[PDB]
Design a protein around this ligand. Structure first.
Ligand SMILES: COc1cc([C@@H](O)[C@@H](CO)c2ccc(O)c(OC)c2)ccc1O
Lengths: 233, 232, 240
C-alpha cells in the first residue's frame, strides 16, 4: 500500500503518455501527407503494418511507399516531395477518440479528416483528367496501433471517405461512380498487396462502427431503452 | 511521502478528468453526425439539460425529444443514421476545459463546424424553407458533473454563430419565441429569460469565456492593455 | 523497475506528470488565443505573451505588449470592427485552431509547437459598406504556426507566435482561382503606424499562394526520431 500506489500511478501515467503518443502519430501523419512526404509516413508504421485504400491493404514500408509515393506523389507533384507551387492537399486532422487495450500493447483510435485540395490555375495543365480542379473531401479513420520496444506505431490505417465535393457545386451535387475491384500489386504497379473481403461511395453511406465504448454507460448502453422515449413528427 | 503520493494522485486524476470531459464532446459529435439520439441522451446526467434556441430540453426525455423526435425525424425520417444522401457532419474542436476546485463539476468551451445537406438523390424529402446544402458553426459552453466517479454532461449549451447556404456563403444569409413542450411536440421543457434570448447571424452576441486568462488569471484587466492601442 | 529506490520512482513520476501538464498548458495558449482573436480582443491576446515575446507577421516582428496591441488592435481591430472589441453585428472572423504537435525542451523551460488554423471570414451584406476596398467580402484562409514558448515563474507564455499563411480564397471562386500579388517589404513602426518593430532578413521573406514554401517541422519523427533518413525510404518508390 505504497509500492501498490506507485505501481498504480506509474500505470496511469503510462496510459496518459500512450494517448498523447497515439494522437501525435495521426497529427504528424497529417502534416507529412499535406506535403506529399511518403518516407515520413512509412516510418510511422510497424514493419508488418498496413494502409487500407479502395478495399485492399498496402503492407509494410513497401506498400506504404507504393501508395503515398509511387501512386499519390507521382499523381499530385510529379514525384517530388512537397509542398510545391500551386498544389493544395491540406487534410486537416481532428476529433480523436483513442482506446488503449487493457495490456497497453495495442490501441484503436477514431479520427477524422477534412481535405481542402486543388491545382491552382498556374499548374492545372498537370492535373490528371477526371479530377476536379478544387475539391473538399471528408473521411473517418478507425485505426490500429502497436507499442513496439516502448514506441507506438501505426499497425492499420483505415481511412473511409464519407463525402467529396467539387468546390463549385458542393456535396449535394456529387455524381455516384461505381468502384471496380482493384487488381493487386505486383500485376497492378500501384495496387494493394491483398484484397479485403466483400464499399461504394457518397451519396451511398455505411456506418463506421465506433471503436470506443459509450463513455458514460459503457457495456450497459442499450439503444432500445432510449428509443422508447422518441415519437413520430 | 503520503502527502507527495496524495498530491501526485490528485494531479493524475485531473489529467484523466480533462481527457474524460473532452471525450464526452468528441463522442457526442460522432453520435449526432449519425442522428443517434440514444447514445447522445446516455451522455447526460439524469437531471441534465440541453439549451437550444433559448429553451431548455430537460433529462433523457428532453434530449430524446430534441435529437430524436425533432432532428432525427427531420433529417432521416426517424432512422438511426447514417443514411443514403444525408450529410450532417459537425466537426468538433478547440476544447478549453476548467475543472472546478472540488473536482466534482467542470465547464468547457468547444466549437463545431457543420457541413450539412440533402444529396440530389434524397432532396425530395427535404423540408421546405431549408437550404439543400449548408455550413453552420456554433460555440458550446457546457457544464459537467462527476457522478459516482463518471463524468457526464450536466448542461449542453450550443449557441449557433453563423449559417450559410453552400452556394451563397455566410455574407449573403438573410425568429419567434418558442412554444414549450408539450403544446409544441418538439418544443423545450421551459424558455430562458428574454434577457438570455439570442437572435441569429448576422446578429452577434459574445459567448463569455468559461476559462480564466491562461497567463494572467484573475490579474488580467482589459483596460491596462487598451491604453496601448491607437486609432487607424 | 522493482530494483529502483522509491525516491527515484517518485521523482521520475513527478517529472512525467509535470511534462503532461506542460503539454496541456501550451495547447491551451493556442486554443485560447484563437477564441480571443475571433472576437478581435487584442488585450487578452497580448496578455498571453512573455514581455519580450513577439508575433511574426509578413516578414516582421511585433515585439512585446506594444507590438501585439499594435498588430491586433491598432491594425486588425480597426480594420475589421472599426476599433471595437468584438464580436459585432455581421462580422465573421472565425480562425478554427487544430492539430497541435508540441515538443517541450529537455530542461522543461521552453517549448515549440506546430498548429494550424482555418479562417472563415467576411462582412455580411448588412455591414459591407464598412469593408475596406480591395478586401474580399467573404473568404477562406489557412496557415501553419510554428511557435515558441517559455515557462516563466511556473507559467507557460508565448515567446514567439509565427503564423505562415498557406492559402487564401474568395468564397465564390476558391483557392485555385486566387491571383498572386507581389508583396512589397514592410515599413517599420513608427514611420508606419501599423508596421512591425523590426524586419526579418530577406532570406525569411515569403511570397504567397500559389507560391509555396515548406514550414519545417519543429518535431522529430515520432517513431524513428533522429534515426529517420529520407533516402532509405525513397529507394522503395518507383516512377509512374
Ligand atoms: C443542440 O445540438 C446541436 C444542434 C445543431 C443544429 O444546428 C443542427 C443539427 O442538428 C441543425 C442545422 C440546421 C437545421 O436546419 C437544424 O434544424 C433543427 C438543425 C448543431 C449542433 C448541435 O450540437
Amino acid at each position: 500500500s505504497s509500492e501498490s500506489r506507485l505501481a498504480a500511478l506509474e500505470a496511469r501515467v503510462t496510459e496518459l503518455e500512450d494517448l498523447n503518443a497515439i494522437r501525435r502519430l495521426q497529427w504528424a501523419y497529417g502534416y507529412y501527407i499535406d506535403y506529399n512526404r511518403p518516407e515520413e509516413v512509412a516510418g510511422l508504421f510497424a514493419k508488418d503494418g498496413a494502409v487500407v485504400f479502395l478495399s485492399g491493404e498496402y503492407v509494410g514500408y513497401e506498400g506504404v511507399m507504393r501508395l503515398y509515393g509511387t501512386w499519390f506523389q507521382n499523381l499530385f507533384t510529379g514525384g517530388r516531395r512537397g509542398p510545391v507551387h500551386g498544389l493544395l492537399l491540406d487534410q486537416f486532422q481532428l476529433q480523436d477518440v483513442i482506446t488503449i487495450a487493457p495490456d497497453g500493447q495495442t490501441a484503436k483510435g477514431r479520427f477524422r479528416g477534412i481535405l481542402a485540395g486543388g491545382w491552382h490555375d498556374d499548374i492545372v495543365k498537370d492535373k490528371p483528367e477526371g479530377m476536379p480542379q478544387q475539391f473538399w473531401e471528408s473521411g473517418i479513420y478507425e485505426n490500429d496501433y502497436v507499442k513496439e520496444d516502448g514506441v507506438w506505431k501505426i499497425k492499420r490505417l483505415d481511412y473511409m471517405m464519407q463525402w467529396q465535393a467539387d468546390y463549385e457545386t458542393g456535396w449535394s451535387k456529387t455524381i455516384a461512380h461505381l468502384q471496380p475491384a482493384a487488381v493487386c500489386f505486383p500485376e497492378n504497379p500501384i495496387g494493394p498487396d491483398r484484397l479485403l473481403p466483400e464499399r461504394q461511395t457518397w451519396p451511398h453511406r455505411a456506418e463506421v462502427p465506433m471503436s470506443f465504448a459509450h463513455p458514460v454507460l459503457a457495456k450497459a448502453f442499450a439503444v432500445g431503452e432510449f428509443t422508447k422515449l422518441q415519437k413520430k413528427w
